[PDB]
Amino acid sequence: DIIDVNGITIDKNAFKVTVNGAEIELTKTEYDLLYLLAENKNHVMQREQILNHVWGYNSEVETNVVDVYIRYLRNKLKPYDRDKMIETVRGVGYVIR
Amino acid sequence: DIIDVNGITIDKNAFKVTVNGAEIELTKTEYDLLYLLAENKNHVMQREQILNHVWGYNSEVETNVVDVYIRYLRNKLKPYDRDKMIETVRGVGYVIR
């Protein structure tokens, strides 16, 4: 939920984005991935690069979490017709254009 | 900073609260502490209880981080004249009233 106390509004989930006057609730990893892509508008990001930035340069995770979470992120954006902004550059990686 | 892409607005720092049309930038731990207190409006929270909720039930941290971060939180609220909402109940703990 959302809390309003001393004139301060704070959400239990910090990892929200606003769109069309509505709210998308994300996880930390989804939020950081969206930011990373958006921060790099029009520049394609190689999967390993996304891994370094979102999961850590020394992460033991399998590189395909990026794929898994790109799908998670798209699914969160589908209800608001924003999913097609995350584009697969097949063979190299992902871009927000 | 803040980013606006496909009609979506996302901040690099998720741990923001709004007040008087302005923005307070917090850390994760400060944000969770503010939420915990605000979620428990008018109920005093014992230090150990805050420790369990914000730092974990099995945390090895010294119990006085709560004090340290209450001060951090107050200092973040002082510029907007909201610091006095976090009250010391001396000897037991903290409350938002």
XYZ file of all heavy atoms in Angstrom, chain A residues 33-94:
528
model
N 17.044 -2.594 -14.147
C 17.218 -2.966 -15.542
C 16.554 -1.950 -16.451
O 17.153 -1.496 -17.436
C 16.640 -4.356 -15.770
C 16.597 -4.842 -17.209
C 17.998 -4.799 -17.826
C 16.028 -6.254 -17.205
N 15.316 -1.577 -16.116
C 14.621 -0.514 -16.830
C 15.426 0.768 -16.808
O 15.582 1.431 -17.841
C 13.259 -0.279 -16.196
C 12.416 0.844 -16.765
C 12.349 0.724 -18.270
C 11.038 0.716 -16.136
N 15.951 1.134 -15.637
C 16.740 2.352 -15.569
C 17.957 2.257 -16.470
O 18.246 3.178 -17.242
C 17.168 2.635 -14.138
C 17.814 3.985 -14.050
C 17.039 5.139 -14.000
C 19.198 4.115 -14.063
C 17.624 6.383 -13.953
C 19.794 5.359 -14.015
C 19.003 6.488 -13.960
O 19.598 7.729 -13.908
N 18.674 1.138 -16.389
C 19.886 0.961 -17.177
C 19.605 1.116 -18.667
O 20.330 1.810 -19.383
C 20.484 -0.415 -16.885
C 21.692 -0.688 -17.762
C 22.842 0.200 -17.333
C 22.064 -2.149 -17.694
N 18.557 0.457 -19.151
C 18.191 0.598 -20.548
C 17.809 2.035 -20.858
O 18.286 2.608 -21.838
C 17.057 -0.362 -20.886
C 17.467 -1.840 -20.824
C 16.331 -2.738 -21.248
C 18.678 -2.093 -21.683
N 16.979 2.645 -20.008
C 16.490 3.996 -20.274
C 17.616 5.012 -20.206
O 17.689 5.927 -21.034
C 15.383 4.362 -19.286
N 18.499 4.865 -19.226
C 19.710 5.673 -19.153
C 20.521 5.599 -20.446
O 21.263 6.531 -20.777
C 20.528 5.177 -17.964
C 21.708 5.983 -17.557
C 22.407 5.329 -16.384
O 22.379 4.079 -16.334
O 22.959 6.047 -15.512
N 20.401 4.499 -21.186
C 21.180 4.263 -22.392
C 20.308 4.270 -23.646
O 20.585 3.542 -24.606
C 21.934 2.941 -22.272
C 23.146 3.050 -21.394
O 24.158 3.632 -21.787
N 23.055 2.499 -20.186
N 19.241 5.072 -23.627
C 18.357 5.251 -24.768
C 19.156 5.272 -26.058
O 20.184 5.947 -26.149
C 17.587 6.563 -24.612
C 16.396 6.724 -25.526
C 15.646 8.011 -25.189
C 14.333 8.113 -25.960
N 13.536 9.330 -25.601
N 18.706 4.480 -27.031
C 19.226 4.397 -28.396
C 20.577 3.712 -28.500
O 21.067 3.531 -29.621
C 19.346 5.767 -29.083
C 18.130 6.636 -28.860
O 16.989 6.201 -29.053
N 18.366 7.873 -28.432
N 21.198 3.323 -27.395
C 22.426 2.548 -27.440
C 22.125 1.103 -27.054
O 21.632 0.842 -25.953
C 23.491 3.150 -26.529
C 24.837 2.530 -26.713
N 25.246 1.418 -26.005
C 25.850 2.830 -27.563
C 26.465 1.081 -26.388
N 26.854 1.920 -27.334
N 22.411 0.172 -27.967
C 22.209 -1.244 -27.686
C 23.141 -1.684 -26.569
O 24.320 -1.308 -26.535
C 22.445 -2.068 -28.963
C 22.179 -3.555 -28.720
C 21.599 -1.520 -30.111
N 22.618 -2.488 -25.642
C 23.390 -3.014 -24.519
C 23.600 -4.515 -24.698
O 22.627 -5.275 -24.775
C 22.692 -2.731 -23.188
C 22.412 -1.267 -22.930
S 23.886 -0.335 -22.481
C 24.006 -0.760 -20.747
N 24.865 -4.936 -24.757
C 25.198 -6.352 -24.804
C 24.815 -7.031 -23.491
O 24.917 -6.441 -22.410
C 26.688 -6.533 -25.078
C 27.037 -6.522 -26.547
C 28.448 -6.051 -26.837
O 28.900 -5.046 -26.288
N 29.139 -6.751 -27.737
N 24.370 -8.289 -23.594
C 23.891 -9.014 -22.415
C 24.906 -8.985 -21.274
O 24.551 -8.702 -20.123
C 23.545 -10.461 -22.771
C 22.172 -10.630 -23.382
C 21.746 -12.086 -23.495
N 22.857 -13.034 -23.404
C 22.718 -14.310 -23.056
N 21.517 -14.794 -22.772
N 23.774 -15.109 -23.016
N 26.181 -9.271 -21.572
C 27.178 -9.284 -20.501
C 27.287 -7.916 -19.834
O 27.473 -7.826 -18.616
C 28.542 -9.737 -21.030
C 28.882 -11.206 -20.751
C 28.875 -11.544 -19.259
O 29.560 -10.845 -18.470
O 28.175 -12.508 -18.874
N 27.146 -6.842 -20.612
C 27.206 -5.498 -20.047
C 26.047 -5.262 -19.086
O 26.224 -4.719 -17.988
C 27.190 -4.467 -21.171
C 28.233 -3.377 -21.018
C 27.937 -2.161 -21.884
O 27.484 -2.287 -23.033
N 28.179 -0.972 -21.328
N 24.846 -5.665 -19.489
C 23.703 -5.551 -18.598
C 23.948 -6.360 -17.334
O 23.665 -5.900 -16.220
C 22.428 -6.000 -19.330
C 22.102 -5.008 -20.445
C 21.275 -6.187 -18.345
C 21.267 -5.589 -21.533
N 24.503 -7.569 -17.488
C 24.793 -8.410 -16.334
C 25.707 -7.685 -15.363
O 25.436 -7.633 -14.161
C 25.423 -9.727 -16.782
C 25.414 -10.841 -15.739
C 23.998 -11.300 -15.557
C 26.284 -12.005 -16.169
N 26.780 -7.083 -15.879
C 27.719 -6.390 -15.006
C 27.029 -5.288 -14.224
O 27.234 -5.145 -13.011
C 28.862 -5.800 -15.822
C 29.725 -6.856 -16.491
O 29.824 -8.005 -16.035
N 30.372 -6.461 -17.577
N 26.192 -4.511 -14.905
C 25.598 -3.339 -14.288
C 24.482 -3.712 -13.336
O 24.400 -3.160 -12.237
C 25.094 -2.379 -15.363
C 26.174 -1.521 -15.929
N 26.840 -1.838 -17.090
C 26.744 -0.388 -15.460
C 27.761 -0.922 -17.328
N 27.724 -0.033 -16.352
N 23.622 -4.643 -13.719
C 22.476 -4.937 -12.873
C 22.798 -6.017 -11.840
O 22.346 -5.947 -10.696
C 21.275 -5.319 -13.755
C 20.113 -5.856 -12.910
C 20.838 -4.106 -14.594
N 23.601 -7.021 -12.186
C 23.840 -8.119 -11.267
C 25.218 -8.092 -10.628
O 25.429 -8.816 -9.656
C 23.635 -9.464 -11.977
C 22.187 -9.855 -12.126
C 21.464 -10.649 -11.284
C 21.295 -9.474 -13.178
N 20.176 -10.779 -11.741
C 20.045 -10.067 -12.901
C 21.434 -8.706 -14.338
C 18.939 -9.912 -13.739
C 20.332 -8.546 -15.166
C 19.099 -9.140 -14.858
N 26.146 -7.296 -11.135
C 27.483 -7.203 -10.582
C 28.543 -7.784 -11.515
O 28.328 -8.791 -12.202
N 29.717 -7.150 -11.525
C 30.773 -7.569 -12.444
C 31.288 -8.966 -12.140
O 31.826 -9.631 -13.030
C 31.943 -6.582 -12.406
C 31.665 -5.301 -13.152
C 31.092 -4.208 -12.504
C 31.958 -5.183 -14.506
C 30.826 -3.028 -13.183
C 31.697 -3.999 -15.201
C 31.127 -2.926 -14.534
O 30.860 -1.750 -15.211
N 31.140 -9.437 -10.912
C 31.669 -10.746 -10.575
C 30.568 -11.752 -10.290
O 30.819 -12.770 -9.641
C 32.633 -10.617 -9.400
C 33.854 -9.795 -9.760
O 34.144 -8.776 -9.127
N 34.569 -10.226 -10.806
N 29.365 -11.504 -10.801
C 28.220 -12.307 -10.415
C 28.352 -13.733 -10.916
O 28.795 -13.981 -12.041
C 26.936 -11.707 -10.950
O 25.905 -12.642 -10.761
N 27.958 -14.674 -10.072
C 27.942 -16.066 -10.480
C 26.669 -16.444 -11.215
O 26.534 -17.606 -11.607
C 28.127 -16.978 -9.267
C 29.473 -16.840 -8.600
C 30.583 -17.433 -9.433
O 30.295 -18.335 -10.234
O 31.742 -17.009 -9.288
N 25.741 -15.505 -11.418
C 24.480 -15.864 -12.051
C 24.726 -16.217 -13.514
O 25.654 -15.706 -14.154
C 23.442 -14.736 -11.909
C 23.770 -13.583 -12.813
C 22.039 -15.253 -12.220
N 23.920 -17.141 -14.029
C 23.951 -17.464 -15.448
C 23.522 -16.257 -16.271
O 22.557 -15.569 -15.937
C 23.039 -18.649 -15.737
C 23.499 -19.930 -15.051
C 22.741 -21.165 -15.499
O 22.024 -21.097 -16.521
O 22.860 -22.209 -14.823
N 24.250 -15.998 -17.356
C 24.036 -14.776 -18.123
C 22.604 -14.638 -18.626
O 22.154 -13.525 -18.915
C 25.021 -14.739 -19.291
O 26.354 -14.756 -18.771
C 24.835 -13.488 -20.153
N 21.857 -15.725 -18.695
C 20.518 -15.612 -19.238
C 19.474 -15.090 -18.244
O 18.306 -15.002 -18.637
C 20.079 -16.963 -19.828
C 20.155 -18.085 -18.833
O 21.175 -18.779 -18.741
N 19.081 -18.263 -18.052
N 19.820 -14.730 -16.995
C 18.841 -13.979 -16.202
C 18.414 -12.724 -16.936
O 17.271 -12.274 -16.794
C 19.355 -13.587 -14.806
C 19.215 -14.713 -13.858
C 20.736 -13.066 -14.899
N 19.341 -12.097 -17.666
C 18.996 -10.894 -18.416
C 17.789 -11.169 -19.288
O 16.796 -10.436 -19.244
C 20.190 -10.397 -19.246
C 19.833 -9.065 -19.912
C 21.414 -10.253 -18.357
N 17.837 -12.266 -20.051
C 16.688 -12.657 -20.865
C 15.453 -12.855 -19.998
O 14.364 -12.360 -20.319
C 16.997 -13.936 -21.645
C 18.269 -13.832 -22.461
O 18.574 -12.714 -22.926
O 18.963 -14.864 -22.642
N 15.612 -13.572 -18.884
C 14.479 -13.874 -18.016
C 13.825 -12.582 -17.553
O 12.597 -12.424 -17.612
C 14.934 -14.742 -16.827
C 13.817 -14.906 -15.812
C 15.448 -16.096 -17.314
N 14.648 -11.616 -17.142
C 14.126 -10.380 -16.571
C 13.681 -9.385 -17.646
O 12.774 -8.583 -17.397
C 15.164 -9.762 -15.627
C 14.963 -10.204 -14.194
C 15.458 -11.421 -13.759
C 14.252 -9.425 -13.279
C 15.261 -11.855 -12.453
C 14.071 -9.843 -11.970
C 14.577 -11.072 -11.564
O 14.407 -11.519 -10.270
N 14.279 -9.423 -18.840
C 13.715 -8.664 -19.949
C 12.272 -9.089 -20.181
O 11.388 -8.245 -20.340
C 14.573 -8.830 -21.218
C 15.899 -8.066 -21.087
C 13.790 -8.409 -22.456
C 15.830 -6.573 -21.342
N 12.001 -10.403 -20.152
C 10.625 -10.880 -20.300
C 9.747 -10.423 -19.137
O 8.615 -9.967 -19.347
C 10.585 -12.401 -20.426
C 10.765 -12.899 -21.839
C 10.518 -14.402 -21.930
N 11.776 -15.143 -22.019
C 12.393 -15.697 -20.974
N 11.868 -15.603 -19.751
N 13.541 -16.341 -21.146
N 10.247 -10.556 -17.902
C 9.523 -10.032 -16.748
C 9.190 -8.565 -16.940
O 8.061 -8.131 -16.683
C 10.351 -10.191 -15.473
C 10.543 -11.623 -15.015
C 11.443 -11.927 -13.998
C 9.827 -12.669 -15.596
C 11.627 -13.230 -13.570
C 10.003 -13.978 -15.180
C 10.909 -14.255 -14.163
O 11.090 -15.550 -13.737
N 10.170 -7.789 -17.406
C 9.981 -6.355 -17.556
C 8.959 -6.047 -18.637
O 8.054 -5.241 -18.428
C 11.323 -5.707 -17.857
C 11.432 -4.193 -17.862
C 10.747 -3.607 -16.647
C 12.909 -3.833 -17.897
N 9.062 -6.714 -19.782
C 8.064 -6.557 -20.831
C 6.664 -6.873 -20.325
O 5.717 -6.129 -20.605
C 8.410 -7.450 -22.013
C 9.439 -6.862 -22.929
C 9.891 -7.911 -23.903
N 10.820 -7.386 -24.888
C 11.735 -8.119 -25.505
N 11.843 -9.412 -25.215
N 12.537 -7.563 -26.407
N 6.513 -7.973 -19.579
C 5.193 -8.358 -19.083
C 4.617 -7.301 -18.147
O 3.397 -7.110 -18.087
C 5.266 -9.702 -18.360
C 5.406 -10.874 -19.307
O 5.164 -10.768 -20.511
N 5.805 -12.009 -18.760
N 5.478 -6.632 -17.375
C 4.998 -5.561 -16.515
C 4.563 -4.355 -17.336
O 3.689 -3.596 -16.909
C 6.081 -5.165 -15.512
C 6.190 -6.078 -14.317
C 5.108 -5.768 -13.321
C 5.145 -6.753 -12.169
N 4.215 -6.326 -11.090
N 5.146 -4.177 -18.518
C 4.834 -3.035 -19.356
C 3.696 -3.305 -20.322
O 3.096 -2.345 -20.817
C 6.076 -2.600 -20.137
C 7.240 -2.095 -19.284
C 8.506 -2.043 -20.105
C 6.929 -0.730 -18.782
N 3.386 -4.575 -20.592
C 2.303 -4.900 -21.522
C 0.959 -4.290 -21.133
O 0.255 -3.811 -22.035
C 2.164 -6.423 -21.668
C 2.677 -6.993 -22.989
C 2.785 -8.533 -22.966
C 4.114 -9.028 -23.577
N 4.097 -10.454 -24.037
N 0.534 -4.280 -19.865
C -0.774 -3.687 -19.547
C -0.899 -2.213 -19.913
O -2.017 -1.716 -20.061
C -0.887 -3.897 -18.030
C -0.045 -5.083 -17.762
C 1.103 -4.989 -18.699
N 0.207 -1.494 -20.046
C 0.183 -0.067 -20.319
C 0.653 0.242 -21.733
O 0.930 1.402 -22.052
C 1.019 0.654 -19.262
C 0.394 0.502 -17.890
C 0.850 -0.456 -16.977
C -0.699 1.279 -17.530
C 0.239 -0.602 -15.727
C -1.306 1.144 -16.299
C -0.840 0.214 -15.405
O -1.480 0.123 -14.194
N 0.726 -0.785 -22.581
C 1.199 -0.691 -23.954
C 2.551 0.010 -24.061
O 2.766 0.852 -24.928
C 0.156 -0.013 -24.820
C -1.128 -0.776 -24.848
O -1.169 -1.819 -25.528
O -2.081 -0.349 -24.164
N 3.493 -0.360 -23.197
C 4.853 0.151 -23.316
C 5.881 -0.949 -23.544
O 7.076 -0.647 -23.609
C 5.260 0.967 -22.073
C 4.224 1.925 -21.525
C 4.124 3.201 -22.315
N 2.805 3.782 -22.097
C 2.579 5.063 -21.880
N 3.576 5.928 -21.864
N 1.351 5.482 -21.680
N 5.452 -2.208 -23.672
C 6.396 -3.320 -23.746
C 7.275 -3.248 -24.993
O 8.447 -3.635 -24.948
C 5.633 -4.645 -23.711
C 4.456 -4.657 -24.672
O 3.576 -3.782 -24.541
O 4.406 -5.526 -25.565
N 6.742 -2.759 -26.108
C 7.518 -2.777 -27.336
C 8.688 -1.796 -27.325
O 9.478 -1.794 -28.280
C 6.601 -2.500 -28.522
C 6.405 -3.700 -29.425
C 5.760 -4.865 -28.685
C 5.817 -6.139 -29.522
N 4.923 -7.212 -28.983
N 8.829 -0.980 -26.275
C 9.972 -0.071 -26.183
C 11.278 -0.805 -25.870
O 12.361 -0.305 -26.192
C 9.713 0.997 -25.120
C 9.985 0.518 -23.711
S 9.435 1.640 -22.417
C 10.750 2.847 -22.416
N 11.213 -1.967 -25.235
C 12.402 -2.779 -25.002
C 12.544 -3.712 -26.195
O 11.752 -4.638 -26.366
C 12.303 -3.551 -23.686
C 12.145 -2.569 -22.536
C 13.534 -4.400 -23.476
C 11.637 -3.210 -21.318
N 13.533 -3.456 -27.038
C 13.694 -4.194 -28.282
C 14.844 -5.182 -28.190
O 15.924 -4.854 -27.688
C 13.947 -3.258 -29.455
C 12.822 -2.297 -29.707
C 13.207 -1.246 -30.719
O 14.117 -1.509 -31.547
O 12.617 -0.147 -30.657
N 14.598 -6.387 -28.694
C 15.637 -7.391 -28.852
C 16.457 -7.057 -30.093
O 15.911 -6.949 -31.195
C 15.008 -8.778 -28.978
O 14.390 -9.158 -27.740
C 16.054 -9.808 -29.361
N 17.755 -6.853 -29.916
C 18.682 -6.788 -31.042
C 19.294 -8.180 -31.101
O 20.287 -8.473 -30.426
C 19.727 -5.686 -30.875
C 20.373 -5.384 -32.202
C 19.093 -4.436 -30.306
N 18.686 -9.049 -31.918
C 18.915 -10.486 -31.803
C 20.376 -10.819 -32.056
O 20.950 -10.434 -33.082
C 18.005 -11.255 -32.765
C 17.320 -12.497 -32.143
C 16.797 -13.453 -33.208
N 16.447 -12.766 -34.457
C 15.243 -12.266 -34.736
N 14.269 -12.379 -33.849
N 15.006 -11.655 -35.896
N 20.983 -11.495 -31.076
C 22.357 -11.910 -31.145
C 23.301 -11.082 -30.303
O 24.335 -11.605 -29.866
N 22.991 -9.808 -30.072
C 23.842 -8.930 -29.272
C 23.205 -8.589 -27.925
O 23.805 -8.813 -26.870
C 24.226 -7.654 -30.050
C 23.024 -7.046 -30.691
C 24.861 -6.660 -29.114
N 21.989 -8.057 -27.936
C 21.358 -7.694 -26.679
C 20.112 -6.844 -26.809
O 19.306 -7.037 -27.723
N 19.955 -5.878 -25.912
C 18.695 -5.170 -25.750
C 18.918 -3.673 -25.832
O 19.994 -3.167 -25.500
C 18.040 -5.537 -24.424
C 17.726 -6.999 -24.365
C 18.654 -7.917 -23.870
C 16.520 -7.477 -24.851
C 18.367 -9.265 -23.836
C 16.223 -8.817 -24.827
C 17.141 -9.710 -24.314
O 16.817 -11.046 -24.296
